[PDB]
Amino acid sequence: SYITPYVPMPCMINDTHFLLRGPFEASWAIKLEITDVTTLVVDTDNVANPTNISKCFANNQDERLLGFTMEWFLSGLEHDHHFTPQIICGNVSKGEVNAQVNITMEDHCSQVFLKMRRIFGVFKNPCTSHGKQNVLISVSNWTNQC
Numbered sequence: 001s002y003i004t005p006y007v008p009m010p011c012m013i014n015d016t017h018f019l020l021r022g023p024f025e026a027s028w029a030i031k032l033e034i035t036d037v038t039t040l041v042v043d044t045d046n047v048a049n050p051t052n053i054s055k056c057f058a059n060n061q062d063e064r065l066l067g068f069t070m071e072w073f074l075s076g077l078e079h080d081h082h083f084t085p086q087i088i089c090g091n092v093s094k095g096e097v098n099a100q101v102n103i104t105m106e107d108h109c110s111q112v113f114l115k116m117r118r119i120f121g122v123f124k125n126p127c128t129s130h131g132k133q134n135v136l137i138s139v140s141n142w143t144n145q146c
């Protein structure tokens with residue numbers, strides 16, 4: 001198989017906060033926050049799916065590298081046709097997160113949890129408890145958190 005060079009540096013803050021530092025020691029990092037807080041609402045222009053979630057990082061600088069990193073992150077989930085979480089892009093210029101990933105479905109939550117447990121290791125399972133669950137994806141600055 002082919003080996004991608006755009007592998008981030010993972011670092012887990014806590015059971016609900018995770019960072020993927022951009023490859024080659026980038027000055028940025030993808031921030032992943034597991035939270036039941038809904039910040040975004042369906043709009044005619046912001047609906048996305050796993051296949052074009054990269055379009056939630058359009059106005060960002062080094063958008064190519066961001067797309068490569070998100071591609072690495074979603075390997076094994078985007079190819080799955082039974083992994084259909086609602087994804088809402090956000091207006092980063094208005095202070096909103098880059099993407100909101102609806103993981104309310106027990107199976108979608110389970111898939112995301114297992115991918116992140118392969119990446120970061122053991123942490124609290126968010127799908128045990130029911131109710132709304134989201135993964136907020138944003139781009140933050142690297143301040144040597146780890």
Ligand SMILES: *[C@@H]1O[C@H](CO)[C@@H](O)[C@H](O)[C@H]1NC(C)=O
Nearest residue numbers: 012013014015016017018033
């Ligand atoms: C996890 O880390 C974030 C970021 O530092 C912090 O704001 C939050 O309070 C922490 N959450 C818990 C459950 O301690």
Ligand SMILES: *[C@@H]1O[C@H](CO)[C@@H](O)[C@H](O)[C@H]1NC(C)=O
Nearest residue numbers: 046047048049052055056089
């Ligand atoms: C992603 O593709 C779907 C159709 O497959 C479309 O509805 C949506 O607008 C696309 N996402 C973006 C951000 O353009």
Ligand SMILES: *[C@@H]1O[C@H](CO)[C@@H](O)[C@H](O)[C@H]1NC(C)=O
Nearest residue numbers: 038040041042086102104105
């Ligand atoms: C997430 O999905 C659930 C059911 O699939 C739905 O009730 C909820 O409204 C969705 N979130 C948003 C912001 O639409």
